[PDB]
Structure 1
Amino acid sequence: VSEAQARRAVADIFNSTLASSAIGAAWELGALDELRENGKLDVSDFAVRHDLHEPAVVGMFTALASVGIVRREGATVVVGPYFDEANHHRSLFHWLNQGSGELFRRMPQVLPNENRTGKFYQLDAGAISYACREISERYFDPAFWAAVDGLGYTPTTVADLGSGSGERLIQIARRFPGVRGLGVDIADGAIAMAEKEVAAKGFGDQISFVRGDARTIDQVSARGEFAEVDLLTCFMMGHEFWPRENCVQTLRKLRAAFPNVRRFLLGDATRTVGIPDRELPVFTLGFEFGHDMMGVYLPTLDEWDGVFEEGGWRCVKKHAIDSLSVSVVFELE
């Protein structure tokens, strides 16, 4: 390449950083929904309506425009050639930046081994939760509902491992009005958020929550309710069960603690293999590099496939997700 080509490529990498951050912010502030409905927007009007500092609002749209996501026309912003694609994956940009940005920013301090004890990185939990709701819905739901449609029975008590916001249990209780639900989450803040949200939607008597580590599910006290659970779900946290030996034992413990579970629906993103560096798709690099930074194991799809029998489960159906890196839903029994 020429020096001019390198110059353009490096300027684009710099601007991409600002656009990337802006995709999450623009989602969250309501701009991308406006642009997807009407195809355009007036930046002063948008700034007044949402009581935002207009000079910053101009930067945000400029940052998006600098890489072809939107176009600026006088007072107006219109959707650019990459709008649909960036909008589709906006929760992933949110996750990377608003949720995870401080991890990546602190690369020089996170990488040194002597630094890597106790609290050594900081995520924004609320922001991660904010993004995870759309990540679940947008990428996981169709496979999730296809698995639910093919259960071959009607659930009476469902337990969700890593229940977070409580939304999955709420949706299951809408599909199956008899159903009792039980969410396990390790984070007491998620427990508080979930109990609150469930109560406001009218489900406080049907759905309840317990703080607990699903890696040590054999220690969770939930008034003997686990024995009545006949459906188990776990989405977007199963990599936490790994390394392999930890995972085998966690699966057996799940198997013994939920002895009346018929189907166990397990959904997660996985570590890819042999994608060429210049062909990496959205998410993949951030998912893998981030967990490598945090010290968290990420299995491949073949590692999952290979653990289940030893774990006490049989995989009877598998669904490919489009495309949140390489992600899947397993139907286990």
Structure 2
Amino acid sequence: SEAQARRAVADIFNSTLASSAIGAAWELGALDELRENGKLDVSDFAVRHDLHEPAVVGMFTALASVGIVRREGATVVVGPYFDEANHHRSLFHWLNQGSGELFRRMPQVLPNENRTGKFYQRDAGAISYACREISERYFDPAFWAAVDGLGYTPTTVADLGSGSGERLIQIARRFPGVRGLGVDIADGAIAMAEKEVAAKGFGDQISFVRGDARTIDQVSARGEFAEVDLLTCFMMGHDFWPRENCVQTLRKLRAAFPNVRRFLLGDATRTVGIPDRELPVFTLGFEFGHDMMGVYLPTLDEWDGVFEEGGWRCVKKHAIDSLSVSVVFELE
């Protein structure tokens, strides 16, 4: 009936603002406060954080509009969907705060004659803020299970796409005096990681180099690569694709890190045959987004069928619970 349609459309409209508020509420500290305390006071929160209170009221209202919170007086309370939304909060951030400009510009991005040069913008800073927690909450457990079953003690580890440095820091903690090499394409990340490494006492163990897995052989730290016996690479596998570029990069990595014994490669992958009305969280946004950026996403099976050609043998594999279909390969 028409009343059902009004309601469902209104919900779509309001989910939009709830969606954008989920990641905002996270960044601003609201969700955390709500998880500990079950309850908060809007004004008191606004004063403490020094936020424009009429906008704060809207934020929670947006969240309340779809049952993530409940409002009673000037009090906001966790609602029936608080845990699900909060569990997945960094995905909403990725979607909105990170990638909001891409989806906004849909009528501009879809036309073929616009799809040349740099044809879309995203907030690089926002993306790395969400990708941090995305790595931690979704990929880490499997990353550690892979490390748990290496069958040897690494002496030198390289991490492709090292971001903030935290993965190499945790590795140094696991294996006290291991050396670390982080490869990152971004100068901001490098400086940040050098600072954070230094901050935690590892300046002497962990160093960073500017670069891309895809041109890893042109990198001037190349002579340090012979020492590396563990290789890691999370959340950028798909950017090695198309398939023939992937084969090339994998071979380049094989040759440049000849003494690597295990290479842990983690990423999300493209799903097949999920029906339109049962699509889980993230999946459509991840997939639709990369199609909008004209970036191909392999499936699990496509990864499976590229390793040997790329010069690697896959010896273990771990599914992620649950971020579309995501996986950690162990290669050798």
Distance between the aligned counterparts of 1:321 and 1:202, measured in 2?
A: 32
**In the TM superposition, what whole-angstrom CA distance separates every residue of 1:137-160 from its partner, at most 9, and x where no partner exists?**
100111000000100000110000
Q: Secondary structure at the match of 1:205?
A: coil
Measured after TM superposition, the shift of residue 194 of structure 1 is 1.7
Distance between the aligned counterparts of 1:166 and 1:292, measured in 2?
A: 29
Q: Unpaired runs of 5+ in structure 1?
A: none
Distance between the aligned counterparts of 1:139 and 1:192, measured in 2?
A: 26
Measured after TM superposition, the shift of residue 249 of structure 1 is 1.2
Distance between the aligned counterparts of 1:289 and 1:185, measured in 2?
A: 26
Q: Secondary structure at the match of 1:307?
A: coil
Measured after TM superposition, the shift of residue 193 of structure 1 is 2.0
**In the TM superposition, what whole-angstrom CA distance separates every residue of 1:229-250 from its partner, at most 9, and x where no partner exists?**
0000000001011011111111
Contact persistence 2:246–2:310 (CA under 8 A): yes
Measured after TM superposition, the shift of residue 201 of structure 1 is 2.1
TM-score normalised by the chain length of structure 2: 0.98
Contact persistence 2:254–2:311 (CA under 8 A): yes
Distance between the aligned counterparts of 2:41 and 2:259, measured in 1?
A: 57
When structure 1 is superposed on structure 2, of 300-309 and 180-189 the one drifting more is: 180-189
Q: Secondary structure at the match of 1:259?
A: coil
Distance between the aligned counterparts of 2:182 and 2:290, measured in 1?
A: 25
Measured after TM superposition, the shift of residue 53 of structure 1 is 0.7
Measured after TM superposition, the shift of residue 126 of structure 1 is 1.1
**In the TM superposition, what whole-angstrom CA distance separates every residue of 1:273-301 from its partner, at most 9, and x where no partner exists?**
01001110000001001111111110000
Q: Secondary structure at the match of 1:120?
A: coil
Contact persistence 2:180–2:205 (CA under 8 A): yes
Q: Secondary structure at the match of 1:68?
A: coil
Tell whether 2:204 aligns with 1:211. no
Measured after TM superposition, the shift of residue 223 of structure 1 is 5.3
**In the TM superposition, what whole-angstrom CA distance separates every residue of 1:56-101 from its partner, at most 9, and x where no partner exists?**
0000000000000000011110110000000000000000000110
Distance between the aligned counterparts of 2:194 and 2:127, measured in 1?
A: 18
Q: Secondary structure at the match of 1:224?
A: helix
Q: Secondary structure at the match of 1:223?
A: helix
Distance between the aligned counterparts of 1:291 and 1:197, measured in 2?
A: 31
Distance between the aligned counterparts of 2:117 and 2:210, measured in 1?
A: 22
TM-score normalised by the chain length of structure 1: 0.98
Q: Secondary structure at the match of 2:220?
A: coil
- The percent identity for this pair of structures is 99
List 4+ stretches of structure 1 deviating above 3 A. Answer: none
When structure 1 is superposed on structure 2, of 196-205 and 269-278 the one drifting more is: 196-205
Distance between the aligned counterparts of 1:224 and 1:20, measured in 2?
A: 47
Measured after TM superposition, the shift of residue 217 of structure 1 is 1.3
Measured after TM superposition, the shift of residue 186 of structure 1 is 1.4
User: What are the residue-to-residue correspondences of 1:131-142 with 2, within 5 Å?
Assistant: 131-142=130-141
**Equivalent residue number for residue 128 of structure 1:** 127
**Equivalent residue number for residue 264 of structure 1:** 263
Measured after TM superposition, the shift of residue 303 of structure 1 is 0.3
**In the TM superposition, what whole-angstrom CA distance separates every residue of 1:148-191 from its partner, at most 9, and x where no partner exists?**
01000001100000111111111101111111101111122222
Q: Unpaired runs of 5+ in structure 2?
A: none
**Equivalent residue number for residue 88 of structure 1:** 87
Distance between the aligned counterparts of 2:206 and 2:78, measured in 1?
A: 42
Q: Secondary structure at the match of 1:210?
A: strand
Contact persistence 2:222–2:256 (CA under 8 A): no
Distance between the aligned counterparts of 2:277 and 2:285, measured in 1?
A: 14
Measured after TM superposition, the shift of residue 202 of structure 1 is 2.0
Q: Secondary structure at the match of 1:313?
A: coil
Distance between the aligned counterparts of 2:216 and 2:194, measured in 1?
A: 20
Tell whether 2:280 aligns with 1:281. yes
The verdict on how the C-alpha distance between 1:118 and 1:196 changes in structure 2, with shifts beyond 3 A counting, is: farther
Distance between the aligned counterparts of 2:164 and 2:265, measured in 1?
A: 17
